[PDB]
Design a protein around this ligand. Structure first.
Ligand SMILES: NS(=O)(=O)c1cc2c(cc1Cl)N[C@H]([C@H]1C[C@H]3C=C[C@@H]1C3)NS2(=O)=O
Ligand SMILES: NS(=O)(=O)c1cc2c(cc1Cl)N[C@H]([C@H]1C[C@H]3C=C[C@@H]1C3)NS2(=O)=O
Ligand SMILES: NS(=O)(=O)c1cc2c(cc1Cl)N[C@H]([C@H]1C[C@H]3C=C[C@@H]1C3)NS2(=O)=O
Ligand SMILES: NS(=O)(=O)c1cc2c(cc1Cl)N[C@H]([C@H]1C[C@H]3C=C[C@@H]1C3)NS2(=O)=O
Ligand SMILES: NCc1cc2[nH]c(=O)c(=O)[nH]c2cc1[N+](=O)[O-]
Ligand SMILES: NCc1cc2[nH]c(=O)c(=O)[nH]c2cc1[N+](=O)[O-]
Ligand SMILES: NCc1cc2[nH]c(=O)c(=O)[nH]c2cc1[N+](=O)[O-]
Ligand SMILES: NCc1cc2[nH]c(=O)c(=O)[nH]c2cc1[N+](=O)[O-]
Lengths: 256, 256, 256, 256
């Protein structure tokens, strides 16, 4: 039986090809996650079909009806057999599905207009503003923080005029590019570097990751693909395959 | 029942108390892993007894007799119920034992005396020598690496005189401090930062991580502790506790 | 029973929530004294309701009818059970009501626009004018002062033109910000620091405190709350809670 | 009946006169506390006899025997009717004896040789050393402290070579004087100022008080001298008498 691989459209993980309208099957898509799916299938030996999640969400549960949307919902309700996507490994998600070892390491990073080379410097000064997404995991991390630096950041951002929070990541990047060095954006390190390697190459990632997270390949609880996929990720990590794929899709196809 | 925790003596993970002669039980030890064990036991609501691994080794499979030693041996042969230590998540270990999600991220870094800011700069120049251990993860990573930069680094190291390889990290740091800016050490980033934060403060860490690894909490295969321990690790990571413990034993206790 | 906690509307002690219309009860208020009331009630384990004093006055005795107004009136005439507010510990108030040990220390300081580093520096020179409230504790302190510096300051202020006395605190701060370094304001050190930590940040605090005063928690005479409240104040001061609460509402929420 | 006033020999509060062996009665002693006792007696209209505490201690429980020593024990066991001394208002003492409102404000301050202004700066730099007494309430303040600055200074102090903690305060000021700018002393603000005003006038108090404490007049619990002495202290504070006595014994009799 062929294995359904649910995933999401997000550059450079999964992207729609230039000549995709004429293509069919798995050839309509390309990216880091497509190559990762190919490597996992080669390691384990199964035939797979790539499918994009219908609602285009990573996955969350509502306190009202206790239902999961997105790829986590697709996994828990039997619609998909495996999720190969930039899905963050969280406790709430891990309670309902099985996560492999993280195949990519990320964290919260600072985006500026290409000095302030760390988070504490940005917190101290008020000359350069900084913002976060209007609603997201990074925003909740800032909200529920204990360290003094992040507490000061959150007290500043929550009570600030104009609203430094931004609806969507694209609007935040646009704000950073417009503000001619006045506004800094806080976001995931992987997306930060991806945008930094995009035209017109006017943004730069500065400093280190504020926290540490990871992306995992998720399977339903009690699935037969859990253990073999976990060993596949570890094998690809020690072989340097995962390092090669990140270099290819972030830098070899970069534009700077 | 009292769960036996197998552990190795490593700084700042598990060091002897300054007055361990006047103490008995788990009060004899302190460090990062002692606090981690305390929090893991608090989450799962059980009592434990810390035990230092007698062989003093992390764990590997014998080439001929196929017998594991170290904490991996203790878990495989039922001499312990958990291994709360900086145990690297690898493939063969994952095949014999169970690993949790990585509670700390590490990679190969460069140690220089307090001109070189990256591995590319290190490879291009020949003024400064550099090497790794005589045998271990770093040397095997450089031996099998197909990437051009690390391939060039390895072919330099193999054909360099005097020999750039050292017998143990202690003599590696010693040779770094004695060469007076004429030697770089390729070691784990955690040990790099720790030695950086020690007196007399004559070493620094340059560049990013060459690869990416992780330390995980090990548990015997088929144990009932694996899932609660994994959830405890995820909860501690999301609450910022692991952020605090790393900063405490690396920077707050630092002498620089 | 429910304990009535009379309070005054003063910043940053008790101020309205940014969206107090949507809220009700004790969640409708915020500030230093709200947190202090929460901790005091937690120590003594009682239920409380925050009520703003209707007259909007701290409390004084009428020289004609000998009737107290404000929160001192509420405590004397049995309209409240406790007064958790910046109430100054004075002689007549101590004669009518009971005060705890001072939970915060304050004095008379100098407010200048961001040449003078002490009160005697103000006294010796004449270029910069300075004054106090037209009616209040500071003017009376300067009036009946036998110390040479304070006596010289007072005899300058009395025989000065244009008049150096302001109607209220807001007018004094405004006159400080409308003189371009040609006017100094003599006010309480707590209000000095507060206005210093607010936008547009064009005022500073120079020199030490001219005298010593304290804010105390006031309880009705012959009540069972006095001794536990005094012990609670002492315990909170010894634990550093009072140090933290001032830092939060003065500096951690500052705008400079 | 004459009132017994227990005191402690401590400059400038209580001191022995140059011609004391010739004199008898209350004339054997002079200082800030002697003048304060005179003012309190005049306000309350009683005659008093000044006595020095036999063991020369302020007061502390001995946990094994549960017996108070010093002037606190003198008051508890009926030996003395009032204590007029630099007795800190603490939680443990307040439960057992009665304290008036504080007549003097003090705190922990930094003593240098006349570089660094504030305590956070001292914490950051490791060039200048600093340490408190081998015992006393300053170490207890530092240990219980949860703020990052004071906690990090405490962790520096605990693990420090050579031992920066000092046996006695005189040895501490001697070490500061001999250290020629290398060692800073942390102690009470009042004693800091007193030593600053004495020959050879080489030490200087710098920065601000780290915490806030106070000295109070102590009376046995449930005694008729409580409220009158409290009112006397308040009246003397509002009359400026306490300011005058502080100036007289710290500066008017200073030597710098
Ligand atoms: N450089 S990267 O973000 O593409 C990246 C990140 C990571 C990789 C591999 C790569 Cl290539 N493997 C590690 C894995 C190895 C073992 C230790 C942690 C997991 C299990 N996780 S990681 O630290 O999240
Ligand atoms: N010691 S550390 O600050 O570098 C550090 C490192 C890591 C942390 C948490 C911390 Cl505090 N959690 C992550 C975990 C979170 C979820 C995603 C990857 C694992 C599962 N692993 S990690 O990337 O190895
Ligand atoms: N830093 S502050 O003004 O908020 C402040 C001021 C003071 C505090 C505590 C704080 Cl946090 N406690 C002291 C108390 C402690 C004991 C000695 C005097 C009173 C009883 N009073 S204080 O010296 O008036
Ligand atoms: N300048 S000083 O240390 O001699 C000093 C310190 C203080 C004085 C008076 C003087 Cl002179 N009175 C105040 C008192 C006044 C009222 C408010 C707090 C107590 C009751 N306490 S204090 O703030 O501890
Ligand atoms: N960077 C990819 C990406 C991955 C995500 N994974 C998640 O589990 C999630 O809850 N939100 C994410 C947002 C993004 N994003 O668009 O920044
Ligand atoms: N704690 C550092 C450290 C951790 C290790 N963990 C392992 O699982 C391992 O096989 N070898 C290690 C060597 C070292 N080392 O000596 O740098
Ligand atoms: N700083 C708070 C503040 C506290 C006060 N307490 C009093 O007991 C009082 O009689 N007058 C006060 C004025 C002020 N003020 O300056 O607004
Ligand atoms: N008068 C100063 C002083 C006053 C003190 N009051 C106290 O209640 C105490 O327990 N210890 C003290 C030590 C000192 N000291 O540093 O000599």
């Amino acid at each position: 039986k062929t294995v359904v691989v649910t995933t999401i459209l997000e550059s450079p993980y999964v992207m729609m090809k230039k000549n995709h309208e004429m293509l069919e099957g798995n050839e309509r898509y390309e990216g880091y996650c497509v190559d990762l799916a190919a490597e996992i299938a080669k390691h384990c030996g199964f035939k797979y079909k790539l499918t994009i999640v219908g609602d285009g969400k990573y996955g969350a549960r509502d306190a009202d009806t206790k239902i999961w949307n997105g790829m986590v919902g697709e996994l828990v309700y039997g619609k998909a057999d495996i999720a190969i996507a930039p899905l963050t490994i969280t406790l709430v998600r891990e309670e309902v599905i099985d996560f492999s070892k993280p195949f990519m390491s990320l964290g919260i990073s600072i985006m500026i207009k290409k000095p302030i080379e760390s988070a504490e410097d940005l917190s101290k000064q008020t000359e350069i503003a900084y913002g976060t997404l209007d609603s997201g995991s990074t925003k909740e991390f800032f909200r529920r923080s204990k360290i003094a630096v992040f507490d000061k950041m959150w007290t500043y951002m929550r009570s600030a005029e104009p609203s430094v929070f931004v609806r969507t990541t694209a609007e935040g990047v646009a704000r950073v590019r417009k503000s001619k060095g006045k506004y800094a954006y806080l976001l995931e390190s992987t997306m930060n570097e991806y945008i930094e390697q995009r035209k017109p190459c006017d943004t730069m990632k500065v400093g280190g990751n504020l926290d540490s997270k990871g992306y995992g390949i998720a399977t339903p609880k009690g699935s037969s693909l859990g253990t073999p996929v976990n060993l596949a990720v570890l094998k690809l990590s020690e072989q340097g395959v995962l390092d090669k794929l990140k270099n290819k899709w972030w830098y070899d196809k970069g534009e700077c």
